[PDB]
Symmetry: C2
Subunit: 104 residues, 2 copies
């Protein structure tokens, strides 16, 4: 698995890509990218539902966690901030790519 | 949305079914089933990834949360118990249906 991390003013984007199909046992072994815990997180990538849930939990200490849905934007699934669950963060792919990508 | 809740000795199964396609705004409004917080939770159902992540977060206070995958069983995605992330709980549909279904 490969991560691409983009640090924006108010959130960090964590994009993952699965290069080979994965077994659940690797969740123990995944090295998750460190982030500024003072900003929320948007998680994006194609993978099994349990991988998204695992990643969303790993970032639960941040102000909010949102999960990217290509038909909506990033849906807030947990928040300890002004955002409510079910709110949407409108991420535009051409705007996010103006930021630096950190490859972990 | 409809929930079916099955209380087993060591975990509670929370199955959901979406009767009409849903907007993210309803996560605020969802009445989630109460469970014995002394047992972990297995979450099952067909729905958007953000709905699974939302439900997994709502049950994070229990000893563990697992997400059902029809090809594997229930994959542990968070745990504060003897289970490790990535472990699998082997649920057999004909055994779980021996239990009482609580409809919320």
């Amino acid at each position: 698995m490969k991560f691409a991390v983009i640090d924006r003013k108010n959130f960090t984007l964590i994009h993952f890509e699965i290069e080979k199909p994965i077994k659940p046992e690797i969740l123990k072994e995944i090295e998750i990218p460190s982030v500024d815990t003072r900003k929320g997180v948007v998680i994006s990538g194609r993978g099994p539902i349990w991988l998204h849930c695992f990643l969303a939990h790993k970032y639960h200490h941040t102000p909010f966690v949102a999960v990217y849905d290509p038909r909506l934007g990033a849906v807030v699934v947990q928040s300890h901030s002004e955002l409510r669950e079910g709110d949407v963060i409108d991420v535009v792919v051409e705007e996010i790519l103006k930021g630096g990508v950190r490859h972990v």
